[PDB]
Amino acid sequence: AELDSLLGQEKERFQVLPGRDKMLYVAAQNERDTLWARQVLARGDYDKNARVINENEENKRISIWLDTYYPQLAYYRIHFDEPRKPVFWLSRQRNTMSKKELEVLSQKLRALMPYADSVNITLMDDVTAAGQAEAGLKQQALPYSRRNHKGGVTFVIQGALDDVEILRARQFVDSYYRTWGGRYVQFAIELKDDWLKGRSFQYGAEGYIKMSPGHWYFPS
Amino acid sequence: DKDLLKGLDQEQANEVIAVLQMHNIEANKIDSGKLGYSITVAEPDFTAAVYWIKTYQLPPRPRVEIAQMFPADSLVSSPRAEKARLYSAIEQRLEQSLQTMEGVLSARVHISYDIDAGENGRPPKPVHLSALAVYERGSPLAHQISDIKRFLKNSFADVDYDNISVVLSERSDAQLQAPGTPV
Amino acid sequence: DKDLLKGLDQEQANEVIAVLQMHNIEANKIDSGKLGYSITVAEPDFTAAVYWIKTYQLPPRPRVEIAQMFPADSLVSSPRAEKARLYSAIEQRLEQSLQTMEGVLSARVHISYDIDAGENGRPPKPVHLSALAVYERGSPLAHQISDIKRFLKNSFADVDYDNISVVLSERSDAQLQAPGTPV
Amino acid sequence: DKDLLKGLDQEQANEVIAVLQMHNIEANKIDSGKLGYSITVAEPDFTAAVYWIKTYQLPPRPRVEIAQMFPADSLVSSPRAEKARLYSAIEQRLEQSLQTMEGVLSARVHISYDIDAGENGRPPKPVHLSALAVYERGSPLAHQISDIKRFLKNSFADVDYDNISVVLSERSDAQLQAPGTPV
Amino acid sequence: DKDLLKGLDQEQANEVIAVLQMHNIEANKIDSGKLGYSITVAEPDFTAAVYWIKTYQLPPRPRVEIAQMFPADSLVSSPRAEKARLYSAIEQRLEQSLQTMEGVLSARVHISYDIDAGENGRPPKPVHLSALAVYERGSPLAHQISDIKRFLKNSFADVDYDNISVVLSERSDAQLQAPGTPV
Amino acid sequence: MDDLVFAGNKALYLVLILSGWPTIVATIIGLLVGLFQTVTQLQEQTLPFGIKLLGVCLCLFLLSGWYGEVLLSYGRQVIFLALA
Amino acid sequence: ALSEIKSAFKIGFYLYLPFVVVDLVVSSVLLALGMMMMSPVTISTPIKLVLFVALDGWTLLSKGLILQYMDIA
Amino acid sequence: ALSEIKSAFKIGFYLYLPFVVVDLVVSSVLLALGMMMMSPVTISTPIKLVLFVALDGWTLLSKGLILQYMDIA
Ligand SMILES: CCCCCCCCCCCC[N+](C)(C)[O-]
User: Fold this and answer.
1) Backbone region of residue A22 per phi and psi (left: phi > 0; alpha: psi in -120 to 50; beta: other values)
2) So where does this one cross the membrane (chains G, H)?
3) How close is the nearest chain F Cα to the Cα of B121, in Å?
4) Quick one: D113 and D145 in the same domain?
């Protein structure tokens, strides 16, 4: 009675991989599927050892290990489109390593992932990342401000946004985050009430708002 | 077999069954007539079934509508009760109309009850509306919010596009394959 | 066979059948008379049938009309109640007239109830109207909105084309072939 | 044979039969007296008949008239109620008059119920009228709208041609040949 | 076996079982019908079960809703009572609507009851709202607070984003494996 | 007009209902106490005159706690109609 | 002058109605108790006073009468 | 002025109650005696007068009114 026979009728929903640790690994695509699988093991329908895994869990676990042994490494994300050969994206500018050091890193990652045969390390450009973010916000016609720091970029999107804007912003941010993660570029979205509706005012270098006749407000 | 719940309504029981099947728990529905429905599961699945029943706070409540608080069996109704019943009927008739639009599966609507004061000697306040709706997969949500706003705006004497909030979402993946039976 | 629902009436049962057949689920309707109709399906389809019943929130509600909140049985009733009944009857008569135009399959109408105020000491506000309708396939919707607006404008003392919202949609594809029986 | 509907009225059954025959579905009407009429079809046609019943929302309602909301058989009447009955009868008498014109098959009329305010303290508003009608094939619609407008204008104290809306349409093709019987 | 609790209802029993299972205590639920449910455990686990029953203050006493203090069914009512029932119905209808959003497992909502002043003569005061909600694991909480605020803002005549508090949390780890039986 | 018509009908109607229940209930009591003389003289209603005398005050007090609310609602309604 | 007088009588009419209701009800209850000979004025008058103070009729009248002419916000 | 009047009615309300009670007692006694065809007012007005004077109602009333506004000492 193989494990694949126990997961259901839809076969291609899951992928079973043997590991050097003498344990079966079940690769899932999302939380719902993850729990659909975990139930089988927790019920005890299978007699040998098995484990369930997914991309978000593995990214978190590996980042927690990196925090301890490489506390200054600049990197983006690990992609598991092909689970036998993950791809690890590192910053070209912020890192400084030799080829030997990169190889050592590769081998230690391979020891953390007993289901993978090798890990490919690829160097990506930060300017590219930041540019794709800004281009996407322009494409969506959102209002924004950009702030630059030594190791990160922050985009502030705040005001009296409309429903359409909220929806399109949410969709875009969700798309970008899945590609680049949240380490280098951050988006801050904030709603605030419109002070200016229905009031006459001067705008320019010397703006002010007439709160009413006889009352001047000078923000600065 | 262990008893989870008894004396359920038809529309509670079907919701529990749906939620357990989603998590790969095979369940059974039994009818006792005047005693209602009973739900049962196997022992290996009992723990999980308990955890999910708690986490979703099942069985579900009856659904609440403002007109229940002001039953028309009255010797006298104040202005306040009549106006409340009125608005609580409009809310329901709007939801029932939105479900007829193309591709909408379900929706909910809310109106700002000014009726919590009579406007007694006071100028009237404008109306605000909120709506939630669920769409079929592959729908251009951005392009469909416009239709809803346009439709709601003219349903009332004075409404501004600024005062209408609309939130849309897509249906989740379909649960077609049956759960596995414990070995 | 597993029981999905009991005690339905005729118009609830026919809706449940229509929805399940659309998704390729063969279902059976049984009549028990004073006990109503029952719906049954095969085991291989039980899971899917449950999921769709949840997704569409079946069985459907009874249809709501504002005249139900203000029964004409009442021995004395205020001018507000009467004005509400009046409007809630005009709405229905309009829907029934639109359903006679060429190509319309079904429709809905909504009117701005200014009776949310008595308009005491104040001028009465202008009327606003909203309408939904479904057309036969191959109809020039753009050219047909004009007729509806023209027809609605004159049903009230003061209405502007700007205050009339109209939303149209086409009928979905016809379900003519029967679903397959489980092997 | 599978049962579609039970307990229909005569005028509901004939409408259903008409709609099914138009789509090539052979149906049978059975009379149970106090239990009403029943409609049945063959299995190969069951699916289609269900889908059409949902698409048209059969069986049809009764027909609403505003006088039904303010019955003459009632112990009390406000002036508003009397005024409503009056208008509701004028409408029906115009509908019955137009059908005697040459070529008109059927018609419907609507009047602006200005009575939804008392016209107290204020000058009364002018009347507005709307009419729908259906003509036999080969009729000059353009040359016939003039007659209708002329006729309607003088039925009220103050009406302008600008305030009268008229919509005309032709009869669809005749359904003369019988549907084919399932093999 | 030692008796922990007797005469429980169905919801209290399932709550206790859930809490005990989380801490690895195997418990049994017994039904005595008119006498309710009873919970029992083994002696080696009696001490622990006692300590947790105290620490969580079990069994849970039932949910409070403000309409319970001013029960609608009465011979008499007063403006304060009516206004209270109204607000206590809007609260419940909003919570029931939020639980339909994508990912939300449960939520709770609170409204500022200004009715503790009559708001007669004294001018009425602006509304404040608070909400709690629990999400499925892997949800961008930061990006989801905006939607909630947007939705709530338009449910009332006068609300500022500054006056709406929202607190979100994720679901805890799932309890799927059964506890071990004492040796 | 229609406001004057409404408030007048509502007055006649309120009189009919508020005077209904007390006289029906008194009829039922007086009937059953007259009938069960057919078994026993049933002194314990009417013999303790002090208790019969207290009963009237008790009845009037309780009744006012059910009707004053109604009259208050009616009063507010008519004043609103008169001035607004 | 004439239109004002008329509108005043109209108001007075509405003010009378609830007290008329009281005056009838109290008599019918005294007849139900058989005390046919007692004059009901002795009991109806205090009820009327109670009703008027609980209704706070002076505040309502004084406010609404001004509201008919002024506009206050 | 509009608040003073309302206070006056509030006070007088509570003073009416005991006299009402006395009227009910008299009527019930005449019925229990069956001495039916006598109007009770003729009997109860002497009783109300003698009772209130014998208790100096006017004195207590005057003190109770002034003590809202002064201390007599
Ligand atoms: C003998 C009892 C008399 C009770 C009179 C109550 C006032 C009725 C005023 C007329 C009300 C009916 N209305 C407005 C249609 O005339």
Assistant:
1) left
2) 11-31, 35-55
3) 9
4) yes
The answer to whether residues D65 and D107 belong to one domain is: yes
- Which residue of chain B comes nearest to G63, CA vs CA? B121
Model resolution, angstroms: 3.3
Experimental determination technique? cryo-EM
Q: Are B49 and B25 in contact (CB under 8 A)?
A: yes
Rounded to whole angstroms, the Cα distance separating B38 from B17 reads 11
What residue in F sits closest to G43 (Cα-Cα)? F60
Structural domain ending residue among the three candidates B24, B43, B60: B60
- Tell whether ligand 1 has an atom less than 6 A from the beta carbon of residue F39: no
- Rounded to a whole number of angstroms, the distance from the CA of F6 to the nearest CA of chain H is 30
Neighbouring chains to F with at least 3 Cβ pairs closer than 8 Å: B, C, D, E, G, H
Residue D34: DSSP 8-state: G
Is the same domain home to D72 and D159? Answer: yes
Residue ranges with strand state E in chain A = 15-19, 23-27, 50-53, 75-79, 87-91, 120-124, 145-149, 152-159, 185-191, 201-202, 208-212, 215-217
Q: Do A54-124 and A125-194 come out as alike in CATH topology? A: no
Please give the CATH topology (third level) of the domain spanning A1-53. Answer: Alpha-Beta Plaits (3.30.70)
Q: Is C175 domain-assigned?
A: no
- Closest Cα to residue E174, out of A57, D181, B51, G49? B51
Residues D75 and D154 in one domain: yes
Q: Is F1 in the pocket of ligand 1 (CB under 6 A)?
A: no
Q: How far apart are CA C107 and CA C168, in angstroms?
A: 9
Tell me: do B118 and B164 sit in the same domain: yes
* Cβ separation C175–D48 shorter than 8 A: yes
Q: Specify the CATH number for A54-124; select among 2.40.30.110, 2.60.40.1120, 3.40.50.2300, 3.30.300.170.
A: 3.30.300.170
The residue whose CA is least distant from atom 5 of ligand 1 is: F12
Domain shared by E79 and E56, yes or no: no
B121 and chain G: CB distance < 8 Å anywhere?
yes
* Beta-sheet strands, E only, within B35-125: 37-41, 104-111
In angstroms, the CA B48 to CA B40 distance is 13
> Minimal CA–CA distance to B66: which of C85, C69, C72, E159?
C69
Residue among E136, E138, E142 minimizing CB distance to A56:
E138
CB–CB of F73 and B78 under 8 A? Answer: yes
Which residues in F lie closer than 8 A to residue G29 (C-beta atoms)?
A: 19, 22, 60, 63
G11, two tokens: 């108001």
Q: At residue D147, what are phi and psi to the nearest 5 degrees?
A: -55, -50
How far is residue C161's CA from residue D130's CA, in Å, rounded to a whole number?
15
C41, C60, C79: which is the final residue of a domain? C60
Asked if the Cβ–Cβ distance from C79 to F9 is below 8 Å, we say no
Going by C-beta distance under 8 Å and a sequence separation of 6 or more, which residues neighbour residue D24? Answer: D179, D180
Position B117: which residue type?
Answer: A
Q: Dihedral of the CA atoms C40, C44, C45, C48 (nearest 10)?
A: 140
The shortest CB-CB distance from F6 to any of C79, C118, C121 is to C79
Q: Give the max Cα distance, chain C.
A: 74
In a domain, B49, yes or no: yes
Ligand 1 mean position, distance from CA E45 (Å): 79
> How far is the C-alpha of E16 from the C-alpha of E8, rounded, in Å?
10
Instruction: Name the residue range of residue D157's domain.
Output: 61-170
Cβ of F16 less than 6 Å from ligand 1: no
Same domain as C65, residue C36: no
Q: Is residue E18 part of a domain?
A: yes
User: Same domain, yes or no, for C33 and C65?
Assistant: no
What are B167's two structure tokens?
Answer: 């939130």
Q: Which of H9, H20, H24 sits opposite G53 (nearest CB)?
A: H9
Which atom number of ligand 1 is nearest to the Cα of residue F7?
Answer: 14
Q: Report the topology of domain A125-194.
A: Alpha-Beta Plaits (3.30.70)
Residue D183 lies in a domain: no
